[PDB]
């Protein structure tokens, strides 16, 4: 099964790009990473950073994730991110988003050794 450190780089991470160019790279994205497939997911955020520097976060500052767990950890330095969510008119399978840029911390949760992000918590 995809390990949750994958599924994380697979969902979150956009090293390719500094930035979202136009107004369809959620919908663009969110395709070809496979997040609608089977359902339309939602919420996405995608981060145009290097994966050493999101891994990085790791051995940032701790803080207590959404859900309680203690295991996440905020970004010392804002980072480019594009956020998507789903239009008022997105409908399976035809999933359709909002592509919005901002540059923010990134809160994600860790796990394993090598210790990486395996959830996207928030961007604050």
């Known amino acids: 099964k995809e390990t949750a450190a994958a599924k994380f780089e697979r969902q979150h991470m956009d090293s ?6 136009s107004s369809n790279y959620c919908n663009q994205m969110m395709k070809s990473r496979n997040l609608t497939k089977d359902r339309c997911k939602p919420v996405n955020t995608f981060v145009h950073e290097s994966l050493a520097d999101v891994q990085a976060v790791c051995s940032q500052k701790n803080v207590a994730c959404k859900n309680g767990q203690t295991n996440c950890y ?10 998507c969510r789903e239009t008022g008119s997105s409908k399976y399978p035809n999933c359709a988003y909002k592509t919005t840029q901002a540059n923010k911390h990134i809160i994600v949760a860790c796990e394993g050794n090598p210790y990486v992000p395996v959830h996207f918590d928030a961007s604050v």
């Not at 390719?16 to 160019?21: D, L, V, Y």
């Not at 905020?74 to 956020?83: A, E, F, L, P, V």
């Open 74 to 83: 905020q970004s010392y330095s804002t980072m480019s991110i594009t956020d």
């Open 16 to 21: 390719s790009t500094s930035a979202a160019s």
